């Protein structure tokens, strides 16, 4: 058996997992059927292992959180774990036992090993006592820029013979912030990217956040718009508005309609000297969004053009503290 969970313990098999989130896998090292086993010395000496072939393109193991526990919840001594970057890089002994167990891995994998096959056998195997491996891994930050499926595969090796235990699939959504230039808050208004802005004209930078899909695996804790604008040409006026980009369903079942003014659910921080403004969603609001709802929002920063010339803007949308850059807009004065 294999299941993926979030930190709070919810089953998240098949769910959308944001870059930066952790997959708290629980792998059952299933020894129940061996109660009253009568296998030979040589079969026992063939050993007991658990193999997790994790998808290293997408995930990094969190080695400090990896645990092997018995049925009382106590850590198991005499079991160790090593993570290898490939079969080729693995010790010869490891290559050989995988071959014998008839296990194929792709790229990087972990091997959990019974240090002393005879002691492990006497204690857990012949007694039919199953163990639970907690094996947390984090989605690579950069993967959020392309997104896509990943799957975790595991194998159990009993008496040197291996077999597949389970596969769990998840998907990483692609987070793609967008930046437009407007002279209106109407979402249908013309984009002035690539066009002219008059000297001392006010206008908006429209910062459209990335889309968090429904069926996501954990709470949203951060959704921010960080705009380091070019203060040689642009001045932030101190005014902004933030709107929902989609219909949101809250944990209480209420619905916030697309286009609703959510400015009061945000805070703002300015650095005029360095020409930066940051707008962040409040936890009080983010914690109310259903895990089964999408989330997306957009901020209109009111600017003033304050010099002749050509000026660019880019903003960064952070989503649970992973940064994603928007396109770069350009206007001329
Ligand atoms: Ca290693
Ligand atoms: Ca792998
Ligand atoms: Ca829209
Ligand atoms: Ca700046």
Swiss-Prot record:
Isoaspartyl lysine isopeptide (Lys-Asn) cross-link, renumbered residues: 179-313
Positions annotated to bind Ca(2+) 2: 30, 32-33
Residue positions binding Ca(2+) 4: 228-229, 231, 274-275
Annotated binding of Ca(2+) 3, by residue: 53-54, 56, 106, 108
Subcellular location: Secreted, Cell wall
Superkingdom assignment: Bacteria
BAR region involved in interaction with Mfa1, as annotated region: 87-113
Function: May bind sialic acid residues of salivary agglutinin (SAG) in a calcium-dependent reaction. The interaction of SAG with its receptor in various oral streptococci modulate bacterial colonization of oral tissue and is associated with reduced levels of dental caries.
Record's miscellaneous remark: S.gordonii, a commensal oral cavity bacteria, is among the bacteria most frequently identified as being the primary etiological agents of subacute infective endocarditis (found in 13% of cases).
Family assignment from sequence similarity: Belongs to the antigen I/II family.
Quaternary context: Interacts with P.gingivalis fimbrial protein Mfa1.
Name used for this protein in its record: Agglutinin receptor
Whole-protein residues included: 1083 to 1413 of 1500
């Amino acid at each position: 058996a294999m299941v993926n969970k979030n930190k709070e313990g919810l089953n998240i098999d098949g769910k959308e997992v944001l870059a930066g989130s952790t997959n708290y896998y629980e792998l059952t090292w299933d020894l129940d059927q061996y109660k009253g086993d009568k296998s030979s010395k040589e079969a026992i000496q063939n050993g007991f292992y658990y193999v997790d072939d994790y998808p290293e393109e997408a995930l990094d193991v969190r080695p400090d959180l990896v645990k092997v526990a018995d049925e009382k919840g106590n850590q198991v001594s005499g079991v160790s774990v090593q993570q290898y970057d490939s079969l080729e890089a693995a010790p010869k002994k490891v290559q050989d036992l995988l071959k014998k167990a008839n296990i194929t891995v792709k790229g990087a994998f972990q091997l959990f090993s019974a240090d002393n096959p005879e002691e492990f056998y006497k204690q857990y195997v012949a007694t039919g006592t199953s163990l639970v491996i907690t094996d947390p891994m984090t989605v690579k930050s950069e993967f959020g820029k392309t997104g896509g499926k990943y799957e975790n595969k595991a194998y159990q090796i009993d008496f040197g013979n291996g077999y597949a235990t389970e596969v769990v699939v998840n998907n990483v959504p692609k987070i793609t912030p967008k930046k437009d230039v407007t002279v209106s808050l109407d979402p249908t208004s013309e984009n002035l990217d690539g066009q002219t802005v008059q000297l001392y004209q006010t206008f908006n930078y429209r910062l459209i956040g990335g889309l968090i899909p429904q069926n996501h695996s954990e709470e949203l804790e951060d959704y921010s718009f960080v705009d380091d604008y070019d203060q040689a040409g642009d001045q932030y006026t101190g005014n902004y508005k933030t709107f929902s980009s989609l219909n949101l369903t809250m944990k209480d079942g209420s619905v916030i309609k697309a286009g609703t003014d959510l400015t009061s659910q945000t805070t703002a921080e300015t650095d005029a000297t360095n020409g930066i403004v940051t707008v962040r969603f409040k936890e009080d609001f983010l914690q109310k969004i259903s895990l089964d709802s999408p989330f997306q929002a957009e901020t209109y920063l009111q600017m003033r053009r304050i010099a002749i010339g050509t000026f660019e803007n880019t903003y960064v949308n952070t989503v649970n503290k992973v940064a994603y850059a928007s396109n770069t807009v350009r206007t001329t004065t």
